[PDB]
Design an enzyme around this catalytic site. Structure first.
Site, PDB file in Angstrom:
ATOM      1  N   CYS A 107      -1.806   4.761  -5.731  1.00  0.00           N
ATOM      2  CA  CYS A 107      -3.258   4.862  -5.617  1.00  0.00           C
ATOM      3  C   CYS A 107      -3.649   5.836  -4.509  1.00  0.00           C
ATOM      4  CB  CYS A 107      -3.871   3.490  -5.342  1.00  0.00           C
ATOM      5  SG  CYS A 107      -5.679   3.596  -5.236  1.00  0.00           S
ATOM      6  N   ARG A 110      -6.860   4.728  -1.577  1.00  0.00           N
ATOM      7  CA  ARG A 110      -6.689   3.535  -0.741  1.00  0.00           C
ATOM      8  C   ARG A 110      -7.418   3.599   0.602  1.00  0.00           C
ATOM      9  NH1 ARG A 110      -0.377   2.674  -0.554  1.00  0.00           N
ATOM     10  NH2 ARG A 110      -0.343   4.850  -1.329  1.00  0.00           N
ATOM     11  N   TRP A 279     -14.021   3.983  -8.774  1.00  0.00           N
ATOM     12  CA  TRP A 279     -14.632   5.145  -9.404  1.00  0.00           C
ATOM     13  C   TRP A 279     -13.536   6.149  -9.714  1.00  0.00           C
ATOM     14  CZ3 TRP A 279     -16.362   3.526  -4.470  1.00  0.00           C
ATOM     15  CH2 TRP A 279     -15.840   4.227  -3.365  1.00  0.00           C
ATOM     16  N   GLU A 284      -8.647  12.984 -13.142  1.00  0.00           N
ATOM     17  CA  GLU A 284      -8.273  11.981 -14.140  1.00  0.00           C
ATOM     18  C   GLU A 284      -8.970  12.241 -15.465  1.00  0.00           C
ATOM     19  OE1 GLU A 284      -7.769   7.808 -12.605  1.00  0.00           O
ATOM     20  OE2 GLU A 284      -9.139   8.587 -11.065  1.00  0.00           O
TER      21      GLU A 284
HETATM   22  C1  HEM Z   1     -12.370   3.465  -5.097  1.00  0.00           C
HETATM   23  C2  HEM Z   1     -12.001   4.527  -5.830  1.00  0.00           C
HETATM   24  C3  HEM Z   1     -10.562   4.705  -6.385  1.00  0.00           C
HETATM   25  C4  HEM Z   1     -10.028   5.880  -6.738  1.00  0.00           C
HETATM   26  C5  HEM Z   1     -10.705   7.270  -6.614  1.00  0.00           C
HETATM   27  C6  HEM Z   1      -8.680   5.640  -7.215  1.00  0.00           C
HETATM   28  C7  HEM Z   1      -7.802   6.599  -7.662  1.00  0.00           C
HETATM   29  C8  HEM Z   1      -6.604   6.327  -8.276  1.00  0.00           C
HETATM   30  C9  HEM Z   1      -5.818   7.269  -9.044  1.00  0.00           C
HETATM   31  C10 HEM Z   1      -6.248   8.724  -9.286  1.00  0.00           C
HETATM   32  C11 HEM Z   1      -4.713   6.641  -9.463  1.00  0.00           C
HETATM   33  C12 HEM Z   1      -3.609   7.245 -10.358  1.00  0.00           C
HETATM   34  C13 HEM Z   1      -3.874   6.590 -11.715  1.00  0.00           C
HETATM   35  C14 HEM Z   1      -3.370   7.378 -12.895  1.00  0.00           C
HETATM   36  O1  HEM Z   1      -3.058   8.584 -12.740  1.00  0.00           O
HETATM   37  O2  HEM Z   1      -3.306   6.794 -14.007  1.00  0.00           O
HETATM   38  C15 HEM Z   1      -4.761   5.261  -8.986  1.00  0.00           C
HETATM   39  C16 HEM Z   1      -3.811   4.277  -9.179  1.00  0.00           C
HETATM   40  C17 HEM Z   1      -3.938   2.928  -8.873  1.00  0.00           C
HETATM   41  N1  HEM Z   1      -5.037   2.308  -8.297  1.00  0.00           N
HETATM   42 FE1  HEM Z   1      -6.631   3.348  -7.369  1.00  0.00          FE
HETATM   43  N2  HEM Z   1      -8.436   4.279  -7.168  1.00  0.00           N
HETATM   44  C18 HEM Z   1      -9.581   3.664  -6.664  1.00  0.00           C
HETATM   45  C19 HEM Z   1      -9.745   2.301  -6.487  1.00  0.00           C
HETATM   46  C20 HEM Z   1      -8.842   1.296  -6.759  1.00  0.00           C
HETATM   47  C21 HEM Z   1      -9.088  -0.138  -6.676  1.00  0.00           C
HETATM   48  C22 HEM Z   1     -10.464  -0.721  -6.291  1.00  0.00           C
HETATM   49  C23 HEM Z   1      -7.954  -0.778  -7.014  1.00  0.00           C
HETATM   50  C24 HEM Z   1      -7.644  -2.292  -7.063  1.00  0.00           C
HETATM   51  C25 HEM Z   1      -8.294  -3.172  -6.296  1.00  0.00           C
HETATM   52  C26 HEM Z   1      -6.939   0.237  -7.296  1.00  0.00           C
HETATM   53  C27 HEM Z   1      -5.624   0.008  -7.672  1.00  0.00           C
HETATM   54  C28 HEM Z   1      -4.765   0.955  -8.192  1.00  0.00           C
HETATM   55  C29 HEM Z   1      -3.436   0.729  -8.723  1.00  0.00           C
HETATM   56  C30 HEM Z   1      -2.703  -0.626  -8.811  1.00  0.00           C
HETATM   57  C31 HEM Z   1      -2.948   1.909  -9.118  1.00  0.00           C
HETATM   58  C32 HEM Z   1      -1.560   2.147  -9.762  1.00  0.00           C
HETATM   59  C33 HEM Z   1      -1.809   2.070 -11.259  1.00  0.00           C
HETATM   60  C34 HEM Z   1      -0.552   2.374 -12.025  1.00  0.00           C
HETATM   61  O3  HEM Z   1       0.560   2.238 -11.447  1.00  0.00           O
HETATM   62  O4  HEM Z   1      -0.683   2.742 -13.220  1.00  0.00           O
HETATM   63  N3  HEM Z   1      -7.528   1.475  -7.140  1.00  0.00           N
HETATM   64  N4  HEM Z   1      -5.927   5.120  -8.258  1.00  0.00           N
HETATM   65  N1  LIG Z   2      -0.306   4.210 -22.580  1.00  0.00           N
HETATM   66  C1  LIG Z   2       0.735   3.904 -21.939  1.00  0.00           C
HETATM   67  N2  LIG Z   2       1.002   4.548 -20.800  1.00  0.00           N
HETATM   68  C2  LIG Z   2       0.795   4.139 -19.518  1.00  0.00           C
HETATM   69  C3  LIG Z   2       1.621   3.186 -18.927  1.00  0.00           C
HETATM   70  C4  LIG Z   2       1.421   2.802 -17.602  1.00  0.00           C
HETATM   71  C5  LIG Z   2       0.404   3.378 -16.849  1.00  0.00           C
HETATM   72  C6  LIG Z   2      -0.418   4.338 -17.425  1.00  0.00           C
HETATM   73  C7  LIG Z   2      -1.521   4.968 -16.597  1.00  0.00           C
HETATM   74  C8  LIG Z   2      -2.864   4.265 -16.769  1.00  0.00           C
HETATM   75  N3  LIG Z   2      -3.458   4.048 -15.435  1.00  0.00           N
HETATM   76  C9  LIG Z   2      -4.898   3.698 -15.534  1.00  0.00           C
HETATM   77  C10 LIG Z   2      -5.423   3.693 -14.115  1.00  0.00           C
HETATM   78  C11 LIG Z   2      -4.829   2.831 -13.205  1.00  0.00           C
HETATM   79  C12 LIG Z   2      -5.268   2.791 -11.894  1.00  0.00           C
HETATM   80  C13 LIG Z   2      -6.294   3.645 -11.495  1.00  0.00           C
HETATM   81  C14 LIG Z   2      -6.906   4.509 -12.403  1.00  0.00           C
HETATM   82  N4  LIG Z   2      -7.906   5.338 -12.010  1.00  0.00           N
HETATM   83  C15 LIG Z   2      -8.938   4.944 -11.262  1.00  0.00           C
HETATM   84  N5  LIG Z   2      -9.619   5.812 -10.624  1.00  0.00           N
HETATM   85  C16 LIG Z   2      -9.300   3.491 -11.212  1.00  0.00           C
HETATM   86  C17 LIG Z   2      -9.099   2.410 -12.070  1.00  0.00           C
HETATM   87  N6  LIG Z   2      -9.637   1.255 -11.573  1.00  0.00           N
HETATM   88  C18 LIG Z   2     -10.262   1.312 -10.359  1.00  0.00           C
HETATM   89  S1  LIG Z   2     -10.167   2.952  -9.821  1.00  0.00           S
HETATM   90  C19 LIG Z   2      -6.464   4.533 -13.722  1.00  0.00           C
HETATM   91  C20 LIG Z   2      -0.217   4.717 -18.753  1.00  0.00           C
HETATM   92  C21 LIG Z   2       1.682   2.896 -22.515  1.00  0.00           C
HETATM   93  C22 LIG Z   2       3.027   2.588 -22.332  1.00  0.00           C
HETATM   94  N7  LIG Z   2       3.469   1.552 -23.123  1.00  0.00           N
HETATM   95  C23 LIG Z   2       2.553   0.982 -23.962  1.00  0.00           C
HETATM   96  S2  LIG Z   2       1.057   1.825 -23.718  1.00  0.00           S
HETATM   97 CL   LIG Z   3      -8.625   6.797 -17.217  1.00  0.00          CL
END
Ligand code: HEM
Ligand SMILES: N=C(Nc1cccc(CCNCc2cccc(NC(=N)c3cncs3)c2)c1)c1cncs1
Ligand SMILES: [Cl-]
Ligand code: HEM
Ligand SMILES: N=C(Nc1cccc(CCNCc2cccc(NC(=N)c3cncs3)c2)c1)c1cncs1
Ligand SMILES: C[C@H](O)[C@H](O)[C@H]1CNc2nc(N)[nH]c(=O)c2N1
Ligand SMILES: C[C@H](O)[C@H](O)[C@H]1CNc2nc(N)[nH]c(=O)c2N1
Ligand SMILES: [Ca+2]
Ligand SMILES: [Cl-]
Ligand SMILES: [Gd]
Ligand SMILES: [Gd]
Ligand SMILES: [Gd]
Ligand SMILES: [Zn+2]
Lengths: 403, 403
Positions: A107, A110, A279, A284
């Site tokens: 993330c 953070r 947000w 993204e």
């Molecule tokens: C406040 C604005 C926030 C921004 C701009 C942000 C941004 C991001 C981005 C860009 C990623 C990479 C996700 C991806 O590429 O799919 C990410 C991952 C993640 N975020 Fe944040 N985030 C925010 C808030 C939060 C909040 C509020 C939470 C939970 C309370 C959170 C928990 C996580 C987690 C667990 C991941 C890892 C997700 C994964 O492994 O797929 N984030 N965040």
């Molecule tokens: N589709 C698949 N791929 C896949 C697997 C694991 C992870 C991912 C990435 C999806 N992360 C979504 C995500 C997570 C955390 C943050 C963000 N962004 C944000 N800003 C926020 C979301 N909330 C608050 S902020 C967006 C994709 C599958 C694999 N196997 C069956 S489906």
């Molecule tokens: Cl998304």
């Protein structure tokens, strides 16, 4: 204690927090698997996790060892002896949700971890109540575009009982529909969930941006279809500040990123339904969701409209089109007064977060491959920053799909 | 064996070659250090490395288990028993150098690994003869702009005698003149070698693109200074195809990237001087060398000349300026008829290499963070490819600076 260098400034720190990493990651001295998306595939066990979480909690409020500290430890022991599990106090749940965010290595947002609205839905029963909690979450978090971070925590997993689950990966997703030619209209990422909503009595649309219904599952029942009230789903039509034909492409995205398929783990307890939202960072939407080859894949469409030379890679037509799509995303969200952060601002704030966490905890778990943005990598400060990746608890974790 | 997924296509492979990794990297189950720039800082041990290398050689020519194979193993054993070391056959040196390139996890250019001209300089006796070998390498490799990959191998390390070393990090480098106030005229990456050249009698310039002399070290000798003949150092003036003022920045870069400070290890033998050269990928020049804040740092100057709004990050001025600098580099090298590859073509060819290597050896060691280019990361196919990083021998390795 690993030594970690910033190659832009030459500064050196030591990550002492990594020594506390509880769970094991996928790497070994023989080979590094840091680039893998998925790094992983009773009362005695639960108690030790619960004890160590309680210790974290009382340390963070400067009351470790206190009489309250001993009292809480003995309460959880009796609870687990009687019921096989235990109940978090409200402040422990808040602390645990914030720490799980704080500990998320992938993330970049953070810097905001201390500001999180926690909605306690642990009294929930039936999918109909889930929908109401979810609707209140969306309402609060959207806030007419002035987005506010929030998490809603549904009841924990417990023995002999099913899970609450949100089948959708996000609260707001666009449908993806297949055809005979194997193509997809809409979001190819959501083809599986789209046919599940159909296989449960949803009348599909024929659009590229049809908002999916929710498939909510209370324990030991099948999921039920719920339609989000359209005035709860804020969307941004995409236009470009100077390319007037961009609007005619009909692109749009939604305001609220609300992840609904991860498992929240606190003190050995597991919450398989705990949707969280914040947000978007602009890349993204503008780079990944719209330009990934396996998503909307619009990059060549935009380049054609820009009259670029798409027949040789060395014209950098892909790079020029990607920049203008990201411009359109930033411009459109700002014009609609929806919170969004660009990748330069977000990585600068993550560097400040790294410095805060060095002082506060001696380090910060960070996944370089996910922290560095998918465009303009080396133009951001995080590219030049060495990082240590490791797993702390409380944590957000992946979990198997319900079906 | 690790399961490895391509997320663009959905395809899955297993890296069975990683199970053969000998030397250990820095990661553990507790924490991943994959993002660190430096991951790493007896006759029976020598024989096991030599035996393994001889086995690789005889496999490569489809003569494993032949009489020649067994006789060569016994021959190496006899030489090690008599002298503590051994000598490679000419054919083995050629094969080993190509294998070290093939094994280099941070090289995106390995589709070419079988096309390498190997110059055997193991008879070299003096720094003067070293300079002649180096001049002939440069002349061959440059080939008037039609660049050809090459390596020159100087004598191996042996007990009782100092190493051959090239002190310069590349055969062609621009001087960096460190100033009073910590500013630099020229390339800040080269401040140390520039000061060492001056201390050894070089009369410095005061320009931004002054080619450095070579500091060449023969065994047990102080380094000796040699000036490259100007006619041997091909350079490319930078202009932009549509921004005519760009040429007035006065930027240039050199044609030939020729890395001269890495150690080549083959079958347990060590070659501390073994410079190798190929050609550039354009992002190395346009994004890293010219836009890194700690290198030439020209991004803001270009953005201002382009009339971009540099007061707000969300205008994406940095991204727009970096794209045009990369366009200029490609346009300028093509106009000069000097070989160069853009990052889209390079990463596409690297995906072909991974497929070849999966078939040939069951895997390919690859460092995701170095393979993905520093701009437009997710617009290239390698971004979506999971990778397994590990150390095979023969290998190119880092080594301490000899001063
Ligand atoms: C406040 C604005 C926030 C921004 C701009 C942000 C941004 C991001 C981005 C860009 C990623 C990479 C996700 C991806 O590429 O799919 C990410 C991952 C993640 N975020 Fe944040 N985030 C925010 C808030 C939060 C909040 C509020 C939470 C939970 C309370 C959170 C928990 C996580 C987690 C667990 C991941 C890892 C997700 C994964 O492994 O797929 N984030 N965040
Ligand atoms: N589709 C698949 N791929 C896949 C697997 C694991 C992870 C991912 C990435 C999806 N992360 C979504 C995500 C997570 C955390 C943050 C963000 N962004 C944000 N800003 C926020 C979301 N909330 C608050 S902020 C967006 C994709 C599958 C694999 N196997 C069956 S489906
Ligand atoms: Cl998304
Ligand atoms: C033929 C064209 C080639 C191209 C386009 C190419 C491209 C690259 C690039 C972009 C890098 C990353 C370098 C950096 O960011 O600093 C790299 C690394 C590397 N290359 Fe290649 N290369 C080529 C040929 C070669 C040859 C001929 C050799 C040796 C025989 C070689 C060996 C290496 C090694 C060992 C590394 C890792 C360097 C390190 O770890 O610091 N490459 N290459
Ligand atoms: N300042 C430091 N920098 C530093 C440290 C570690 C690594 C590096 C990166 C240097 N890669 C140069 C390089 C290597 C290999 C390939 C290429 N490109 C090419 N196309 C080719 C070169 N030949 C044939 S193709 C370019 C820089 C220090 C480290 N420790 C004290 S200082
Ligand atoms: C294979 C690779 O790990 C995968 O594509 C990762 C790379 N880095 C990423 N970084 C972010 N922010 N989001 C992602 O989905 C990914 N995907
Ligand atoms: C900290 C990080 O490892 C470092 O800045 C790396 C990242 N990836 C890279 N990738 C390439 N090709 N070259 C580099 O110098 C770097 N630098
Ligand atoms: Ca001999
Ligand atoms: Cl270079
Ligand atoms: Gd058909
Ligand atoms: Gd037109
Ligand atoms: Gd012009
Ligand atoms: Zn690792």
């Amino acid at each position: 204690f690993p030594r970690v260098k910033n190659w832009e400034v030459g500064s050196i720190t030591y990550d002492t927090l990594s020594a506390q990493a509880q769970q094991d990651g996928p790497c070994t001295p023989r080979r590094c698997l840091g680039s893998l998306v998925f790094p992983r595939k009773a009362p005695e066990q639960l108690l030790s996790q619960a004890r160590d979480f309680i210790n974290q909690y009382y340390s963070s409020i400067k009351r470790s060892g206190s009489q309250a500290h001993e009292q809480r430890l003995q309460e959880v022991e009796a609870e687990v002896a009687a019921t096989g599990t235990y109940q978090l106090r409200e402040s422990e749940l808040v602390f645990g949700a914030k720490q799980a965010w704080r500990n998320a290595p992938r993330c970049v947002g953070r810097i905001q971890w201390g500001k999180l609205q926690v909605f306690d839905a642990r009294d929930c029963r039936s999918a109909q109540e889930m929908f109401t909690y979810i609707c209140n979450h969306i309402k609060y978090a959207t806030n007419r575009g002035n987005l506010r971070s929030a998490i809603t925590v549904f009841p924990q997993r417990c023995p002999g009982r099913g899970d609450f689950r949100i089948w959708n990966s996000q609260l707001v997703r666009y449908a993806g529909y297949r055809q005979q030619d194997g193509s997809v209209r809409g979001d190819p990422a959501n083809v599986e969930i789209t046919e599940l909503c159909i296989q449960h009595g949803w009348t599909p649309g024929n659009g590229r941006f049809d908002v999916l219904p929710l498939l909510l599952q209370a324990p030991d029942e099948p999921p039920e279809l719920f339609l989000l009230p359209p005035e709860l789903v804020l969307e941004v039509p995409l236009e470009h500040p100077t390319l007037e034909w961009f609007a005619a492409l009909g692109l749009r995205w939604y305001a609220l990123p609300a992840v609904s398929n991860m498992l929240l783990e606190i003190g050995g307890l597991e919450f398989p339904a705990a949707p969280f939202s914040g947000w978007y960072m602009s890349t993204e939407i503008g780079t990944r969701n719209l330009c990934d080859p396996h998503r909307y894949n619009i990059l060549e469409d935009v380049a054609v409209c820009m009259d670029l030379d798409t027949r040789t890679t060395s014209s950098l037509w892909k790079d020029k089109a990607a920049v203008e799509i990201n411009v359109a995303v930033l411009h459109s969200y700002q014009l609609a007064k929806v919170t969004i952060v660009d990748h330069h601002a977000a990585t600068a704030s993550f560097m400040k977060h790294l410095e805060n966490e060095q002082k506060a905890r001696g380090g910060c778990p960070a996944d370089w491959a996910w922290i560095v943005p998918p465009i303009s990598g080396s133009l951001t400060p995080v590219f030049h920053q060495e990082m240590v990746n490791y797993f702390l608890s409380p944590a957000f974790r992946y979990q198997p799909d319900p079906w």
